[PDB]
Structure formats: structure tokens, C-alpha cells
Design a protein around this ligand. Structure first.
Ligand SMILES: [Mg+2]
Ligand SMILES: [Mg+2]
Ligand SMILES: [Mg+2]
Ligand SMILES: [Mg+2]
Ligand SMILES: [Mg+2]
Ligand SMILES: [Mg+2]
Ligand SMILES: [Mg+2]
Ligand SMILES: [Mg+2]
Lengths: 216, 159, 60, 179, 51
RNA sequence: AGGACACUGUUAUAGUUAACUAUGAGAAAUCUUUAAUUCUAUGGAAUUAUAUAAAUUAAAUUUAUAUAAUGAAUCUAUUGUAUAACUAGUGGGCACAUGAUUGUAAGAAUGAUGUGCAAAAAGGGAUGAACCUUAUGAAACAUUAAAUAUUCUAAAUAGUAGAUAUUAUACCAUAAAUAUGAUGAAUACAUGUAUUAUUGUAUAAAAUGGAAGAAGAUUACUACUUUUAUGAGAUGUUUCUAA
């Protein structure tokens, strides 16, 4: 069976990835990182809510799956299947090891104790430092109260201390709301599918007019 | 990483970025005489005449000049003491040690001051390097300089 | 004070020179010390506790 | 300090007016001068606090600076009690915070020390961790706290509960009144 | 053995600086071993005709 | 170390006409880059005149060697420095502070820099090889450090305020996720609802009769300042013994 979570909780100094030096690695359990209506454009969901961390820890790969189903099942029940976009940020890269002391030993090719004690791989975790975002939702102006509750249920699946709060950016772009409104007044904004792109004065002049019909 | 002649050289014997290729003609035109000062820098493009990796970047003196080698004397730190080493290298691994040029100019100029004071009866006023002592005095003007008030300021979160 | 007052009438400041020397006092005993801080205490003649010397102040 | 057991009228902290500039060089002779007021115990402690403030607003290292002149400010006290409001920033375990308090004292040197006594219980931090922005004398109709507004009203009378002995002796006979 | 300690490098620096560190003096030049033999024969002939 | 996704290895999803544009995650055996630190070398000899060669050049033309003369040039410390001859013990080590590798973890195993115990006195941590002050012959008098001042026990129950829980140890002799109270504390909103800071209780279970060192303490507990005093081969003053 799987070991308790207190055996793998604190960070080592060096990472240990899957590469040609470490080949035999088992597979993953989590498969869906983005849930909800992810096809909606920039102007549909203008309010983003984050979950910011407060600890230096290892979060297991199996725990990230159960935390996503908890936040997704609640927002369906209240907001609907087409009123939010949910995503997870991190990806598990680190690999753990087990020494695995057995019963039958004291013979050829089965030694005891600390002789030849390099570990064999078991599973994967993600490495999380201080002040890092783990999950996020974007919604409309109505469901601001619901997503502070749905992100609360996901917090009790992780070890440590975490805090949910309201961000001040406009959706899933890296733009503040104050910076967003001045650019849309001038018209130096471009309409890409998921987020925006900023138009500048760097290229040749003939290509600037070619970019201008994809304004908004 | 066993004990060989060229062990543990991955970033010491790598040629830098955008600078590959055989060296130029300004290396070969230089000359060396007995009693100079020479630093050692390995160019990792020729394989005849490379010294050991320990001597990369240490300065010595030139005592012999051969048809294909130059002789350099150094100092190594063997367990208790400081010993004496000699090595023979090629011309494409050296560099003229600067740092005596400001000194040798001071020798030539002080030798001129001694010559002009022979015709007079005065004492010599030599050139030696300056000293730094306590902070000297200075004079500020308050006609165009106005003081700026500085104080604390309340804290504001980044978001 | 006379050179300070004569520059006061023309709105000049005249910050004066530094002192020429310092006074160094040893207070804490130096039994277990690092090899560099043991070498500098030898050059100041400060092997005994509660003792004082005089030292010219330079950049070094 | 005749009746009390500590000096509450002249606290250890004082008021110093400071000024400094950079040492002159060849590229830049005659540079800019600055001025401020810091509260400390001597001019050497006030030199260290002021030079750290100049490290943050401008990129001026304190090793290149030179101290111009520092003098102390004293106030001719009359003895009337006044109202004061102090705004400051304190450092705690989690981060920095900023607050506001209102006090009642004789002078602004004395009104600062009433803040250190209150901060010893509510905040529990060393005295070097509070950074004082400004002290101002408050007139009427700016008092935002009922504690100052309760004592400002005239003709106050209230008695005192007596609990202190009037003899510094080991034993007295029974029925002697310690009034 | 008892699988004892293999070996350390502690106080190698302390044992060195007990009597200081002596610097072996390089002598006069053109006397170290390895001078060019063709250069040395002409140096010998130039000194005999001198004195 | 920090930095970056431009080369090598890796990863989630949306767009435009396989190619370009975005928002996200990364590296013991990746690098367009790149500090603090660690280390090497110079801070006195050079120029002029004359001569020698069997080297060297198209060549008095260079490379070298002599003899004569012309000199004290960065701050601090050190009255000695340098050289030989002869000979013993030891080659099972451990601990603290900083930073690492294997291991679920260990008073576990193995490396790196500094200082100790071993082989080191007195005073303090109730008691302890390694923690904190601290250099050494026999004594007397005054001043402090480390640590303490209800009583055992030398030395002021000398001040502002809070804590209701049989509260109170630098190394040091354990407590968590989580759930809720209280301030004449602060900010936003409508006397109250939201956050932030400080703080109390629950969570909290063992083998003979028990350990804040103990009696006992709610002004002998906790938080923050200024004075006074006690207290070490330490440090001062005087007498005496050792090449
Ligand atoms: Mg070959
Ligand atoms: Mg022994
Ligand atoms: Mg002892
Ligand atoms: Mg104890
Ligand atoms: Mg007593
Ligand atoms: Mg005393
Ligand atoms: Mg003594
Ligand atoms: Mg004594």
C-alpha cells in the first residue's frame, strides 16, 4: 500500500527528473488540467480568483487530482457548466525512492540492511516554494461569491496553510485592470482568441496597417 | 574522473562562444627575451606543447629560448614548502604580463629628474606613488544649493 | 572659528578636516579566534585585554 | 524625579535635526544636501538610523557619505496638557503595518513615550522597530477617539481608591492606620 | 576491521604553518638545469678570450 | 548561488493563414549569461661608455658575457635571520557552529572550513568531557564580565500594564491539521457586519508515590525602559620565589 504523507513532505536541495539516467518510471493518474468552458473569449469572464500558497512543501500527484474534482463539482451545481473556466498550474516532475526491505534474504542476490541502499522509483510530486499560485478560476460578475466557497473545499486536500483571495488582473492575461482600460481607450489592443496582444510601433510601417484590422 | 593527464576539464578546456578556430598571426610575430614576465593561457586548439592544467593562469619568468620551446620558472606548493618548477611550452600559449609598465615608466622619469638636478645644487624630488589618508576639507555654497526634506512614508501593498 | 565665520557671511559651509589619529581599545578576550583575526591583532600589539594603543588613520 | 520612580518628564529619546551630503569627487563636485528629523538617544544612534533611510529612497551607500551637522531641539515648556495624534509604521512577525493613535501629554517628547508604554502590551515589540512619521498638535473637533473626548471636558472630579502603605518598616502594632 | 573511518584532511593546514612556509630561492639565471647546449658553448668561448 | 527558456532534455490549452501569435510550468549529469568570496603576480634596479665569441644576420646585425660609475623609492609589525647533526612518541579519535550525499528516520553511516575535548584550572547553566565569560608561581586589598536580587542563598517584594490555564528552562530534555472566544487596537461598510495585528481555551491517553531545582507564588507568571548592589588563576596596587 501507499506510505503516509509525512514521509515525503519537505524539499531536498536537488531535483531528480525522468531522463535517460532514470528510465523505469510508472505512469500518472491526473489527466485533465483545464476544466469548464475553456473556449470562451476575453470578454466573457473578466474576474479572476487565485489561491496563493504559504509553505515550502511537496504536493503529491494523486492529491492534485482529488482537489480538482472537488472544486469542479461544486461550481457545476451552482453556476452551471458554462459560467467558469478552471485550471491547474503545476506539473509533477520530481521522483521519489523506496529502499523496500523484504522478508526472504540472507542469501545470494538478496542482501539485508544498509548494504547497496540506492532507492527504486515509486511516484511523482510537485515542488512548491513560498508565495506561488496553484489554481485559478475566471467567472462573470455574478458568481464571485460561489468561487470563494468552491476554492475553500479544495484547500483541505493539501497539507500546510493556504489562502484564497481576489486578484486584481483582468482574466488570464498578465494585465492589471488599470492598465487594461487605458490601452482600450487608445486602441493599442489586439484580439487574439484567449487573451489580448499589445500592438507597438516597432515593425515596418506597412505591416502595422496589416495588423490593424484585427484590432478588437 | 580517474587519475589521468587531462582529468576534470569540461569548462577549462572549452573554447568560448563564437570564437572557434585556429589563432591568428599576431601571436606568432611576438618575441621573448631572457628575464621577461609571462602569463600562461591554454589555447585548446593545438595538441603539441600543452602544459598540465594546474599552471593555467600563473605568471613566471623566461630563462631559455629554444627553436621550438620557451622555458618558464614557477613556484608550486608541495606539502610543506614552496618549490621550484620548470616547464617548456609553445608560443601559442603565452601572453605578455603587463603591470610593470606603470612601474618602468616611473623608473625612466625619475632617472631624468636625477640628471637635471646634477647641474643644479638642489636636492632630488623623486616620484613615488600617492598615499590616501584622512578626508580633506571642502567648501560648499548655499547660493544655488537648497536642502531637500526627507521623511518616512506609509506602507502600501503591491496589489 | 574665524575661518568659519568669514565663510558664513558669503553663505559658504567650510566642512573641516578629519582627525589625524585614533584610539583603539581591546575589550573582549581572544582565546578562540579565526586565523585572520588572530593575525591582525598581532600587528596592532594587542595581546593583553584592557589595553590601548594609538594608530594613524589611512585608507588601509 | 522626586516623587516618581522613573523620569517621565524627560524620557531617554530626544529630537535631533540632521543633514548630510556626499563626499565631493572629480566627476561631481558640490552635490545635493538633505535634511530630516529623527528621534533617538544620541547623535550616533541618530546617524545610523538616518543613513539607512537614505539608502532606500536613493542609491546612496553610507560608506561614501559625510555628516554635516546635528543639533538638538528643546521646547520651553509651560505646563498645560495638550492633545496629540501620532501616525507610525511598526514591524511585526508577519510584515509591516501602519496605524494611528491619539494621546494626551505635555510635550511631543513626552507624548512619544506614552506610545512606547502602550505598544509594550498591544504589539509586544522592541522600541527600535517603530518608525514614527509625524507628531502634530491637534486642535478641537479633530478628536476621533472617545477617550480623549471624555477627559477634555472641563471640571473633572473623581476620587481615588486607597491601597498604599505609608510606612517603610518591618512590623507595626495592630490598629495603626495606614491611610 | 570494524569498518573504521577511511581518512580525513583536517588540520593539514594547521601542521603546515607551525614553522612558517619557506620560499626556496631561485638562484642566478642561466644556471638552472635545461639551458640550450648550443647557447652554452658559445658562452664558454666568449669568456676565455676575455680573460 | 541568483538568472533564462536563446542551444540539449520536458510540459497544459486556446487562436490566424505545416508556419506564426498568446497565457502557464521546469532541470545533479542544459547555457545567449553571471556576483559575494578564494587565489596568483609587480610595488627597485635601470641607464651610459668600453671590450669578448668558434653563436646569429643581407649587414655592428642582433642575441649573450665582463669591467667602471650612478640608489633607497606603500601602510603596519618583527632585533635577529639562515644552515647543519642526532633522536623519541603517534598512524582505533570524538563534539559544537555553517553548509551538503545515502536513508521513512536515528545519540545512524561517510566527506568540506573554523575552534575545542583528548592533554584545560576557577565562576555560571540544580546536576553533565565538548555550552557561556576567560591564560596560567605563593598571598592581601579595590573594579568588572557570564549570571542573578521573596526564602533556602551574598545582593531594591525598587516601575507601567496584561494573562484565569496548578501558567514559569538559549543548547535542553516535544506537540500538529482543525474549530471558536476577548480588547475602551486599526481600516472598509451599514450601535452592528467584514478583514488585519496581539492573545486565551479545546483538540491532549499508561503502567511503584512526583518534579518550574524546591517551598510555594495571581505584584515570585508574561512584555518593554532607566538606576542601585552582589559576584571569576580576569583586570589594576604592594611584598616575596624561579635563566
Ligand atoms: Mg600524437
Ligand atoms: Mg589516549
Ligand atoms: Mg568548569
Ligand atoms: Mg537545567
Ligand atoms: Mg539575603
Ligand atoms: Mg562591589
Ligand atoms: Mg593574571
Ligand atoms: Mg586576580
Amino acid at each position: 500500500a501507499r506510505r503516509p504523507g509525512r514521509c515525503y513532505r519537505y524539499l531536498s536541495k536537488k531535483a531528480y527528473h525522468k531522463s535517460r539516467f532514470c528510465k523505469s518510471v510508472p505512469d500518472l493518474k491526473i489527466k485533465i488540467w483545464d476544466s469548464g468552458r475553456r473556449k470562451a473569449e476575453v470578454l466573457d469572464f473578466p474576474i479572476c480568483i487565485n489561491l496563493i500558497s504559504h509553505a515550502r512543501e511537496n504536493i503529491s500527484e494523486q492529491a492534485l487530482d482529488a482537489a480538482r474534482i472537488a472544486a469542479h463539482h461544486y461550481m457545476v451545481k451552482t453556476a452551471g457548466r458554462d459560467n467558469f473556466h478552471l485550471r491547474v498550474n503545476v506539473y509533477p516532475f520530481h521522483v521519489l525512492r523506496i529502499n523496500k526491505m523484504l522478508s526472504c534474504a540472507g542469501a545470494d542476490r538478496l542482501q539485508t540492511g544498509m548494504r547497496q541502499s540506492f532507492g527504486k522509483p515509486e511516484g511523482r510530486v510537485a515542488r512548491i516554494f513560498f508565495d506561488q499560485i496553484v489554481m485559478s478560476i475566471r467567472t462573470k460578475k455574478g458568481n464571485e461569491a460561489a468561487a470563494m466557497e468552491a476554492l475553500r473545499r479544495s484547500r483541505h486536500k493539501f497539507p500546510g496553510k493556504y489562502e484564497v483571495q481576489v486578484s486584481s488582473k483582468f482574466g488570464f492575461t498578465g494585465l492589471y485592470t488599470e492598465e487594461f482600460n487605458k490601452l482600450r481607450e487608445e486602441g493599442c489592443l489586439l484580439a487574439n482568441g484567449n487573451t489580448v496582444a499589445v500592438l507597438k510601433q516597432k515593425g515596418p510601417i506597412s505591416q502595422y496597417m496589416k495588423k490593424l484590422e484585427k484590432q478588437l | 574522473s580517474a587519475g589521468g593527464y587531462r582529468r576534470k576539464t569540461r569548462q577549462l578546456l572549452k573554447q568560448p562562444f563564437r570564437k572557434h578556430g585556429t589563432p591568428g598571426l599576431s601571436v606568432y610575430l611576438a618575441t621573448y627575451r631572457i628575464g621577461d614576465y609571462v602569463t600562461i593561457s591554454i589555447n585548446p586548439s593545438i595538441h603539441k606543447g600543452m602544459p598540465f592544467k594546474y599552471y593555467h593562469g600563473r605568471t613566471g619568468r623566461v630563462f631559455t629560448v629554444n627553436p621550438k620551446s620557451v622555458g618558464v620558472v614557477l613556484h608550486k606548493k608541495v606539502n610543506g614548502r614552496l618549490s621550484v618548477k620548470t616547464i617548456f611550452v609553445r608560443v601559442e600559449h603565452l601572453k605578455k604580463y603587463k603591470g610593470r609598465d606603470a612601474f618602468l615608466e616611473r623608473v625612466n622619469k625619475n632617472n631624468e629628474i636625477l640628471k637635471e638636478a646634477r647641474e643644479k645644487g638642489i636636492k632630488l624630488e623623486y616620484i613615488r606613488q600617492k598615499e590616501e589618508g584622512p578626508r580633506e576639507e571642502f567648501i560648499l555654497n548655499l547660493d544655488e544649493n537648497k536642502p531637500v526634506k526627507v521623511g518616512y512614508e506609509p506602507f502600501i501593498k503591491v496589489y | 572659528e574665524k575661518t568659519k565665520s568669514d565663510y558664513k557671511s558669503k553663505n559658504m559651509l567650510y566642512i573641516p578636516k578629519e582627525p589625524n589619529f585614533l584610539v583603539v581599545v581591546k575589550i573582549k578576550s581572544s582565546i578562540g579566534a579565526a586565523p585572520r583575526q588572530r593575525s591582525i591583532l598581532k600587528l596592532l600589539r594587542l595581546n593583553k585585554t584592557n589595553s590601548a594603543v594609538l594608530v594613524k588613520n589611512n585608507k588601509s | 524625579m522626586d516623587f516618581a520612580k522613573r523620569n517621565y518628564t524627560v524620557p531617554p529619546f530626544k529630537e535631533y535635526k540632521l543633514s548630510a551630503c556626499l563626499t565631493p569627487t572629480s566627476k561631481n563636485p558640490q552635490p545635493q544636501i538633505y535634511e530630516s528629523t529623527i528621534y533617538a538617544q544620541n547623535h550616533v544612534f541618530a546617524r545610523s538610523k538616518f543613513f539607512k533611510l537614505l539608502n532606500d529612497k536613493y542609491k546612496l551607500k553610507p560608506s561614501k557619505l559625510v555628516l554635516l551637522g546635528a543639533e538638538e531641539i528643546k521646547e520651553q515648556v509651560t505646563g498645560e496638557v495638550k492633545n496629540y495624534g501620532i501616525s507610525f509604521v511598526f514591524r511585526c512577525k508577519k510584515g509591516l503595518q501602519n496605524s494611528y493613535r491619539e494621546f494626551r501629554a505635555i510635550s511631543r517628547v513626552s507624548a512619544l513615550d506614552f506610545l512606547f508604554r502602550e505598544a509594550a502590551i498591544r504589539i509586544r515589540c522592541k522600541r527600535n522597530d517603530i518608525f514614527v512619521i509625524d507628531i502634530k498638535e491637534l486642535e478641537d473637533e479633530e478628536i476621533k477617539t472617545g477617550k480623549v473626548a471624555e477627559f477634555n471636558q472641563p471640571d473633572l472630579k473623581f476620587p481615588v481608591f486607597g491601597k498604599y502603605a505609608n510606612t517603610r518598616d518591618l512590623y507595626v502594632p495592630v490598629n495603626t492606620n495606614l491611610s | 576491521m570494524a569498518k573504521k573511518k577511511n581518512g580525513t584532511l583536517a588540520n593539514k593546514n594547521y601542521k603546515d604553518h607551525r614553522n612558517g612556509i619557506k620560499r626556496q630561492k631561485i638562484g642566478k639565471l642561466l644556471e638552472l638545469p635545461g639551458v640550450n647546449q648550443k647557447f652554452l658553448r658559445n658562452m664558454k668561448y666568449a669568456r676565455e678570450g676575455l680573460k
